[PDB]
Structures are given as C-alpha cells and as structure tokens.
Design a protein around this ligand. Structure first.
Ligand SMILES: *[C@@H]1O[C@H](CO)[C@@H](O[C@@H]2O[C@H](CO)[C@@H](O[C@@H]3O[C@H](CO[C@H]4O[C@H](CO[C@H]5O[C@H](CO)[C@@H](O)[C@H](O)[C@@H]5O[C@H]5O[C@H](CO)[C@@H](O)[C@H](O)[C@@H]5O)[C@@H](O)[C@H](O[C@H]5O[C@H](CO)[C@@H](O)[C@H](O)[C@@H]5O)[C@@H]4O)[C@@H](O)[C@H](O[C@H]4O[C@H](CO)[C@@H](O)[C@H](O)[C@@H]4O[C@H]4O[C@H](CO)[C@@H](O)[C@H](O)[C@@H]4O)[C@@H]3O)[C@H](O)[C@H]2NC(C)=O)[C@H](O)[C@H]1NC(C)=O
Ligand SMILES: *[C@@H]1O[C@H](CO)[C@@H](O[C@@H]2O[C@H](CO)[C@@H](O[C@@H]3O[C@H](CO)[C@@H](O)[C@H](O)[C@@H]3O)[C@H](O)[C@H]2NC(C)=O)[C@H](O)[C@H]1NC(C)=O
Lengths: 207, 209
C-alpha cells in the first residue's frame, strides 16, 4: 500500500474565490485489509476538516482511497506544511507524507505577447506567442482568451530553469489567419504569487 | 549484479556528415574477482567488428566500469537499423543483450520562425530573441543561435512539446544586451532535423528602424 500527496492547483491558491485542496491518495489497499485511517496536520497541528472518499475498487483488484483537505490560500502561500498520515492493518508503521510550497525567494514574472512572424502569414493558421519569464517559484497559470472567453487551441511549454536561476515559459495560441487579420484582440493572462493581485494580463492584436 | 546501458548517438552527429555518431554500450557493477567482459555488436542481426572498447575503469566500491563505443553510419541510424549490444561475463547466467534504434514515426518537416522582442521588453538591459520551431516529428532535433559566424551562447530552449496534431514544437530563447540589438546586429537561428532538406535550415532576425 503506497501514499501519494498532491498540492493544490496554482490557480486555486492565487485566487481567493477558488478553493485550494491538498489530496492524499492511498493505492494498493488489499481486500484482506481494506480499511484506512487518515490523520491530517498543518505545521504539526492535527486538523479535523478533511473529507474522505469511500474506497473504490480498481481494475487491478485493489482499492483506491482518497482524502481531501481544504487549505487556506494564505497558509499555503506562507509556506505551511501539510502532513497526511495513513494507517492500515497490513502496515507495520503508518506512512507519513509532507508537502508545502516550493521554497526560494519569489521573483515577479515579466509577460510579453509576440505577434506571428511575417513568414507564417502564408499558412492558414498563425501562432500568437506569450513569453513569461523571470519568475520564481515555477508554479504558475498562463491562459489565453479573446473577448473574455478562453481560446481553444493552445499549449504551454513546461517552465525551464534560466541562467539567473529564475524560470521562463512560452505559451503558443493557434488561430485562423483570418481572425488575426480581421484585427481581433487576444490576451494572455498570467497568475503567480509575485504579481500584484496575483494577476496580470497582456493583449495582442494586428495593427 | 552486472547491468548494461545502451545509449544512442547525439541527434546532430547523425544529421551532419562531418560528425561521428556513436552508439555507446556501458557496463557497470562488474565483479572485482571475475571481471573479464566480452562485447558483441550487431546491426539488424549482422555482426560488426569495429567497436572500440576502453579498458576497465575500477571504481571506489571494488566495481569495474567498461565502456564500448560503436561508430555508426549516419544513413543507417536515420534509416531505422537496430543496434544490439551483447555483454557476456562469468558472473552472469545468460549473456545480457540490449537493443536500440531511432524513434519511429512518419517524419514531418519543422517550420522555423524568428520573433523579435516585445516593445515592452526594450526598457530592460537585456532582450529576448525568440525562435519558434513547430510541426516537427520525431522530437530529435538541434537548435542553435549565432551572429557574425561565431556561436551565440546565452540561450536556452524548451523541451519539445506534443502539439494538438501529433507534431512537436519548441521555443529557444536567446538573451543579448539591448545595445547589441539596437545596433542592428543579425542573429540567426539554426535548426537541424531529419525531415529538413539537407538536415538544415536557418532563419535570421535584425532590428527595423
Ligand atoms: C493498480 O492501479 C492503481 C491505480 O492506477 C495503481 O496506482 C498507481 O501507482 C503508481 C505508482 O505505484 C502511481 O504513480 C505515481 O504518480 C504520481 C503522480 O503522477 C502524476 O503527477 C505528476 C506531477 O504532476 C505535476 O507536475 C508535473 C511536473 O512537475 C507536471 O508535468 C504536471 O503537469 C503537473 O503539474 C501541475 O501541478 C503542479 C503542482 O504539482 C504545478 O506546479 C504545475 O503548474 C501544474 O499545474 C506527473 O509527474 C506524472 O506524470 C508522469 O507520468 C506520465 C505518464 O502517465 C508521464 O508522461 C510524465 O512524464 C511523468 O512521468 C503524473 O501525471 C507521481 O508523483 C509518483 O512519482 C513518485 O514515485 C515514482 C515511483 O512510483 C518515482 O519514480 C518518482 O520519482 C516519485 O517519487 C520520488 O519522490 C519521492 C518523495 O518525494 C521519493 O521517496 C522517491 O524515491 C522518488 O524520488 C508516481 O509516479 C500512480 O499515481 C497510481 N495511480 C493512481 C490513479 O493512483 C497501482 O500501482 C496499480 N497496482 C499495481 C501496478 O500493482
Ligand atoms: C559502485 O560505484 C559506482 C560509481 O559510483 C556505481 O555506478 C553507478 O551505477 C548507477 C546505478 O545504475 C548508474 O546509474 C545510471 O545512470 C544513467 C545516467 O546516464 C542512467 O541512464 C541509468 O538508468 C542509471 O540510472 C551510474 O551511471 C553509475 N555511475 C557511474 C559513475 O558510472 C555503482 O552502482 C556502485 N555499486 C554499488 C553501490 O553497489
């Protein structure tokens, strides 16, 4: 029986309207010993608000059991540690796992929208690029939209370590050439702890 | 006990005829007492006799490490031939065999596009010159920057990323002093990939006053 502990999603911790959660997932729980007990601690102090799922049988004949703790946005961002302790009768000592935000001094992202290269205008679809650089830690959300609605066809690269020890990434949005040439506006919005109000937005249009 | 690792050539070694692509078979945790290792090599089942093994390197836990390098024809690797390394030893029951070959899949030509820095970046000491490379398959690729026929190395590239059509893209960011950009220097983004004519293409980027 193994334990895997998951941090909340970055967008959820950066935005007070959303609800950040840490998730403790226990796998390889047997039929022979099918009950699990969780104990949840924030900075070593036991908490009691966790919601545990009823166990679910997998295709491989084992059980999956999941416990979810809601965390306060500011506790996560302030580096508090979350411990999930799991007990089972086929376990000599219970497994403990501990998670918290990436350590290190935060650096603020610099966001740059780059139009498509002149050479790409011969194609039916063009590439609008969002350079997000100079940020730390790596946890970040970068999204594209137009007229306040999420754009369909894009992908970000993973964050990459830069020479100064900060991170960068690129997000590529693909749009029909006509939509660009008709002069529609597109915006890359970025969320990160080091941004004022955890949010900045940069637009990009043909002119 | 004894393990074997089989490594492939560096993409660009295979992509330029002047360079020497190698398949490298490394053997580790060879016993202190009965060490002698023999290397057999095969290309599509057919034995080849030009591998250059190095004498054993004794470690600091009474274990030997014995590397063996096989030079490979460029066009063989690109044409999907299979390279088998066979390592035998007295302390093995069966000799260990490992096989390796190029990533499969229909090749697709990368498209290459240089993007200048956003005007919002010109308030900084250093600016970002960007090369987008998309539509390529397989992911094996080399991207490099230069100026005035000297390599320009203050750049980092992203990993290849699977795009929404099965092809890969990546970006490579070059960082240069703002002054160098403002003065009209040409920077170029070299791309090397099996699906490009002559395995090479190059795109340039300069300031427009
Ligand atoms: C019966 O069925 C059961 C049910 O299926 C089955 O259970 C399964 O068991 C296996 C192992 O036994 C479990 O495997 C584990 O999976 C974990 C979760 O993996 C996923 O998430 C990872 C992280 O994702 C974030 O981060 C990535 C990079 O950092 C990003 O790429 C992601 O996008 C994502 O980012 C997002 O979140 C960030 C915050 O986290 C945020 O910043 C960011 O912005 C963004 O929002 C991914 O890495 C991972 O992807 C892997 O797999 C896919 C293919 O599916 C590949 O394409 C990827 O490249 C990658 O390889 C998943 O999406 C893992 O964390 C866990 O890893 C650890 O354990 C393994 C060995 O098991 C180690 O090799 C590994 O190194 C990790 O351990 C290390 O650290 C610990 C301590 O920290 C250390 O002790 C250890 O020694 C080691 O160093 C592992 O792989 C699987 O989860 C179970 N499934 C389920 C459904 O529960 C069961 O086994 C079956 N029974 C059998 C087989 O008998
Ligand atoms: C005794 O000492 C030597 C040297 O420290 C150890 O050799 C090392 O063995 C590890 C374990 O397999 C090798 O790891 C391999 O690394 C490559 C990276 O390219 C990876 O692709 C492989 O999958 C694997 O993880 C490692 O290369 C090797 N070190 C060296 C310098 O060659 C050995 O394990 C030790 N033996 C013990 C502790 O019993």
């Amino acid at each position: 029986p193994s334990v895997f502990l998951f941090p909340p999603k970055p967008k959820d911790t950066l935005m007070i309207s959303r609800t950040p959660e840490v998730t403790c997932v226990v796998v390889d729980v047997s039929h022979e010993d099918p009950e699990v007990k969780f104990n949840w601690y924030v900075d070593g102090v036991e908490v009691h608000n966790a919601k545990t799922k009823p166990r679910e049988e997998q295709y491989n004949s084992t059980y999956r059991v999941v416990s979810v703790l809601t965390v306060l946005h500011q506790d996560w961002l302030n580096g508090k540690e979350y411990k999930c302790k799991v007990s089972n009768k086929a376990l000599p000592a219970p497994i403990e796992k501990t998670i918290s935000k990436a350590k290190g001094q935060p650096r603020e992202p610099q966001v740059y929208t780059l139009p498509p290269s002149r050479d790409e205008l011969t194609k039916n679809q063009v590439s609008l690029t969002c350079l997000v650089k100079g940020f730390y830690p790596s946890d970040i959300a970068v999204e594209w939209e137009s007229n306040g609605q999420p754009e369909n066809n894009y992908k970000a690269t993973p964050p990459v370590l830069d020479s100064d020890g900060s991170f960068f990434l690129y997000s590529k949005l693909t749009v029909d050439k006509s939509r660009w040439q008709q002069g529609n506006v597109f915006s890359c919005s970025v969320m990160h702890e080091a941004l004022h109000n955890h949010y900045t937005q940069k637009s990009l249009s043909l002119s």
